[PDB]
Amino acid sequence: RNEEKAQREANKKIEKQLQKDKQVYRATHRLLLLGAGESGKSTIVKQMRGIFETKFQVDKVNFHMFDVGGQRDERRKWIQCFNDVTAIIFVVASSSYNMVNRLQEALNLFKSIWNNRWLRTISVILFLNKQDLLAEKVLAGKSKIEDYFPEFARYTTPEDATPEPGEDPRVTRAKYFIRDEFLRISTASGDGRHYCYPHFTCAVDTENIRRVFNDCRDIIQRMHLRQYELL
Amino acid sequence: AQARKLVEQLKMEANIDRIKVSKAAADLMAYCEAHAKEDPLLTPVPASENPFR
Amino acid sequence: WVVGMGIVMSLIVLAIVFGNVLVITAIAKFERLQTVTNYFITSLACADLVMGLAVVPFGAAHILTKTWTFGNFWCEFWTSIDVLCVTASIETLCVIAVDRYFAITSPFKYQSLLTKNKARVIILMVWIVSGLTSFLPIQMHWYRATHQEAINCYAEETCCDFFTNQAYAIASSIVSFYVPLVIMVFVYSRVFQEAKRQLQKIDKSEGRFHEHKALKTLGIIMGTFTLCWLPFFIVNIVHVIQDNLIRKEVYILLNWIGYVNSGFNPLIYCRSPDFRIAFQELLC
Amino acid sequence: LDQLRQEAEQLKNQIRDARKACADATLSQITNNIDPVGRIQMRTRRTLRGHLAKIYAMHWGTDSRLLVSASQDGKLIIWDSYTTNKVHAIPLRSSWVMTCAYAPSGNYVACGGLDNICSIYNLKTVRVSRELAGHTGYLSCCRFLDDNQIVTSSGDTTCALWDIETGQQTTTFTGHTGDVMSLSLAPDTRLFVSGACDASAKLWDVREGMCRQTFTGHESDINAICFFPNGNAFATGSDDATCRLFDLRADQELMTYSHDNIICGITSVSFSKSGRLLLAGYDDFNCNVWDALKADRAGVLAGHDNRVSCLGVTDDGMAVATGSWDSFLKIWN
Ligand SMILES: Nc1nc2c(ncn2[C@@H]2O[C@H](COP(=O)(O)OP(=O)(O)OP(=O)(O)O)[C@@H](O)[C@H]2O)c(=O)[nH]1
Numbered sequence: 001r002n003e004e005k006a007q008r009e010a011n012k013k014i015e016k017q018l019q020k021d022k023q024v025y026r027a028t029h030r031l032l033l034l035g036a037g038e039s040g041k042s043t044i045v046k047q048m049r050g051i052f053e054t055k056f057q058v059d060k061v062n063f064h065m066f067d068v069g070g071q072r073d074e075r076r077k078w079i080q081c082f083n084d085v086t087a088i089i090f091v092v093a094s095s096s097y098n099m100v101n102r103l104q105e106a107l108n109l110f111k112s113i114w115n116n117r118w119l120r121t122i123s124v125i126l127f128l129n130k131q132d133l134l135a136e137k138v139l140a141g142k143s144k145i146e147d148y149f150p151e152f153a154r155y156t157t158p159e160d161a162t163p164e165p166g167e168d169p170r171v172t173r174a175k176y177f178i179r180d181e182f183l184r185i186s187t188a189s190g191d192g193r194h195y196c197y198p199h200f201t202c203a204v205d206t207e208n209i210r211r212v213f214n215d216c217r218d219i220i221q222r223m224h225l226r227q228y229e230l231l
Numbered sequence: 232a233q234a235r236k237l238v239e240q241l242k243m244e245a246n247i248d249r250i251k252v253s254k255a256a257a258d259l260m261a262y263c264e265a266h267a268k269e270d271p272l273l274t275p276v277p278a279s280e281n282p283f284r
Numbered sequence: 285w286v287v288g289m290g291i292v293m294s295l296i297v298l299a300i301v302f303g304n305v306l307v308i309t310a311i312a313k314f315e316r317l318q319t320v321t322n323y324f325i326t327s328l329a330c331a332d333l334v335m336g337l338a339v340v341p342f343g344a345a346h347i348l349t350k351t352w353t354f355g356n357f358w359c360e361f362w363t364s365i366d367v368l369c370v371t372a373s374i375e376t377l378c379v380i381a382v383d384r385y386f387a388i389t390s391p392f393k394y395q396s397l398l399t400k401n402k403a404r405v406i407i408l409m410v411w412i413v414s415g416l417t418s419f420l421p422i423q424m425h426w427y428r429a430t431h432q433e434a435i436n437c438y439a440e441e442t443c444c445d446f447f448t449n450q451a452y453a454i455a456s457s458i459v460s461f462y463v464p465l466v467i468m469v470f471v472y473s474r475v476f477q478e479a480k481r482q483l484q485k486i487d488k489s490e491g492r493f494h495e496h497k498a499l500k501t502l503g504i505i506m507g508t509f510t511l512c513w514l515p516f517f518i519v520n521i522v523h524v525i526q527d528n529l530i531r532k533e534v535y536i537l538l539n540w541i542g543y544v545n546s547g548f549n550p551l552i553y554c555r556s557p558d559f560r561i562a563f564q565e566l567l568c
Numbered sequence: 569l570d571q572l573r574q575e576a577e578q579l580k581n582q583i584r585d586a587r588k589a590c591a592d593a594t595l596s597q598i599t600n601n602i603d604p605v606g607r608i609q610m611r612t613r614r615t616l617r618g619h620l621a622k623i624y625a626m627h628w629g630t631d632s633r634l635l636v637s638a639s640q641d642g643k644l645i646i647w648d649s650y651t652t653n654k655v656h657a658i659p660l661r662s663s664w665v666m667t668c669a670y671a672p673s674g675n676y677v678a679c680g681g682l683d684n685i686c687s688i689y690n691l692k693t694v695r696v697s698r699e700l701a702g703h704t705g706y707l708s709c710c711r712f713l714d715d716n717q718i719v720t721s722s723g724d725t726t727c728a729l730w731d732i733e734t735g736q737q738t739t740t741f742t743g744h745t746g747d748v749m750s751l752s753l754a755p756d757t758r759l760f761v762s763g764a765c766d767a768s769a770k771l772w773d774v775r776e777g778m779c780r781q782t783f784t785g786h787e788s789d790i791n792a793i794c795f796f797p798n799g800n801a802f803a804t805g806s807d808d809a810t811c812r813l814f815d816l817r818a819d820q821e822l823m824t825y826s827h828d829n830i831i832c833g834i835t836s837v838s839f840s841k842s843g844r845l846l847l848a849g850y851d852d853f854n855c856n857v858w859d860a861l862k863a864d865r866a867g868v869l870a871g872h873d874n875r876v877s878c879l880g881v882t883d884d885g886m887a888v889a890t891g892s893w894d895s896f897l898k899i900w901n
Pocket residue numbers: 035036037038039040041042043044069129130131132133201202203204
């Protein structure tokens with residue numbers, strides 16, 4: 001008699017609280033921060049500001065970011081939990097093409113992440129970090145790309161490619177060669193579900209917060225367009 | 232070294248007593264037969280006693 | 285002769301009822317299909333089912349027997365329900381188009397703008413507005429005509445026809461057809477521009493290594509509706525302004541071509557793979 | 569030195585020779601004159617709603633009435649099977665949780681996840697009562713051995729036995745190579761097993777703290793493990809679409825459960841009250857019911873729109889519950 005009346009109030013309170021929390025859950029977009037070793041995730045997240053979290057807001061839109069450097073392990077099995085994120089941010093050191101090779105390991109990591117069974121419909125926002133050390137090494141440097149990557153010798157910069165102001169042609173050629181190797185993996189097995197968004201960012205640059213916003217908006221727009229069979 | 236512990240550990244697993252497979256199979260069959268009438272999932276209960284009905 | 289027409293009408297009724305009942309059953313039975321967008325579709329299916337179960341069979345019986353064998357009240361009710369179904373089966377298309385426009389052009393605010401609470405209010409408002417222009421001007425005698433033929437036919441209980449004055453004929457057309465038409469045109473223009481921009485972006489980004497679908501989809505969606513309903517609502521305005529421009533038979537033919545549109549909505553708005561899988565299980 | 573590594577193999581072989589000599593027949597040969605149980609049909613009885621995201625874990629209560637469940641939205645909810653009305657809704661500091669547990673006395677609830685911290689809550693006071701730290705990887709399972717001590721397994725190839733009152737580890741178990749996925753306690757709570765990520769299951773001793781046996785039957789990662797009610801057998805489910813029933817005394821497997829029409833992994837394994845029916849959850853969004861004595865399928869439990877990630881059977885053996893990524897709990901009977 002009294003038991004049902006007692007339980008009804010608790011049920012109503014819990015249901016009301018869940019209905020309230022549903023809106024704030026749906027409003028926020030979740031990202032995943034995943035990078036190679038010594039790439040520069042820490043400086044990027046610091047400029048933006050076993051687990052590390054960050055909540056930030058732009059244009060009345062709430063983003064909420066996940067660093068996973070805690071359980072770094074050779075074998076990833078916690079990758080299954082992240083099949084419901086909006087985007088994956090990849091940070092790679094562009095200037096480390098001769099040390100330790102490291103760029104080959106980064107490319108292998110990107111290829112393995114791209115073809116994961118559980119992450120078939122997740123896009124990748126890619127930040128080619130450390131843009132100034134690359135120019136420093138290229139401009140009159142002892143070590144050049146063809147020594148470590150043989151294919152660089154014949155490659156020439158695309159005609160339609162637009163170089164930034166006051167940039168030597170060699171720097172532009174090497175910079176676009178680096179991006180092409182990353183886009184080649186994505187175009188091979190995409191099939192339309194997910195894409196890649198290359199970028200060129202250094203540590204000093206502070207406009208990345210707008211690039212992430214624009215890329216997330218484009219990702220959602222493309223998903224909605226494809227759902228209705230118009231793209 | 233680390234191996235010595237490994238050698239020691241594996242040597243430990245060697246010195247145990249094992250029984251024939253037929254005995255274990257007979258014991259499992261005997262237990263399953265003995266408790267075969269005291270579960271609802273195998274033998275459905277009358278709808279009166281089911282609390283979810 | 286007469287029978288062949290009779291044979292067709294039966295096929296039309298069977299198809300219209302079957303498709304809509306299948307769609308409603310598939311949406312209702314399965315939990316996966318419940319979505320904010322699927323309330324509008326089920327409202328449209330319910331309206332089309334009401335039309336195909338109420339207005340088509342009685343109209344076919346009247347045209348075959350060439351004489352109304354019921355009372356004046358019954359055919360007045362038939363006219364009211366027919367107008368209600370027709371004017372409620374288009375604003376739903378307009379609402380669906382506006383929902384797609386919000387979903388595509390403003391992806392961040394789509395969750396907040398449209399919720400499960402607002403959809404029911406929108407559907408109720410649309411149905412109330414549809415029923416306000418159908419039962420009120422017809423059950424009350426404000427729509428009736430003045431000329432000799434109409435008043436002579438009104439008293440007789442053997443023939444029930446449709447004679448209206450200029451005011452109702454223009455007003456119902458404006459409420460039912462043109463206002464949804466302009467909205468749908470503008471919405472789909474904006475949606476086409478968005479797809480063109482996104483294709484341009486993808487091609488610029490990765491053209492080196494590697495607009496037809498959007499054109500085909502928009503073409504079918506707009507063309508079916510326009511071809512089915514547009515010709516009738518021209519002659520509807522015309523036959524009042526000009527006394528003897530249009531005969532009776534052409535008017536009736538265009539009106540019955542209009543009803544056919546109710547049989548194509550399930551084949552247009554329910555081609556998603558989820559709907560196909562849901563149909564699989566219910567069917568087999 | 570070199571001799572020592574060489575020294576080990578004479579040992580591995582002696583083990584193989586002893587196990588080969590122990591076998592005299594197969595379990596199928598003896599279990600051949602038993603009348604089959606027949607086709608079994610289960611029907612849904614209750615369906616619980618209220619989770620906003622996918623579900624990873626659940627654990628039936630000791631009273632066979634209440635149960636707890638965890639989701640990826642960071643919320644623990646305690647249900648009531650009979651009346652299907654919620655009782656508690658405990659928010660979580662971290663939105664990533666991979667396990668949950670329920671005390672035998674019904675006073676405490678534990679949960680842990682991607683953050684390497686195990687949390688304990690007091691139901692009958694709802695505030696955090698104790699936080700346990702010390703692992704270097706994500707947790708995978710946690711079981712209350714009693715009201716004062718908990719045993720956990722982590723992704724850093726270790727397991728531990730905690731003391732809630734003081735908050736420090738008591739004994740540490742080592743010997744695995746890869747990650748540790750699941751564990752189960754014996755009915756007398758003196759021994760427990762584990763399923764590693766390198767296709768190997770080990771039997772530990774709680775009091776001594778040293779490994780006793782090792783089984784290397786499978787070929788891929790082991791995702792779930794369940795302990796036979798008698799206490800002398802256990803079943804493991806791997807990612808190669810097979811289940812195996814081992815035996816502690818015989819120190820080798822007896823039967824295998826596989827079919828040619830499935831190529832999906834196995835996410836959960838459980839037994840019945842009598843130990844006759846073995847239930848396993850697959851990635852094909854459905855569940856299968858086996859026969860522990862004949863390796864012949866006896867039913868399918870379909871109805872879930874996404875993969876099954878949790879499974880449990882009541883202590884009274886009245887009903888079986890399933891959880892899926894579609895954020896729905898179902899009670900079958
Ligand atoms: N020249 C240059 N140096 C950078 C840039 N970004 C980071 N660095 C340097 O790279 C060093 C290592 O990167 P951190 O910023 O510490 O990031 P991190 O934590 O090492 O990155 P992970 O090791 O991948 O976690 C830092 O000491 C930075 O000074 C850049 O854009 N240009």
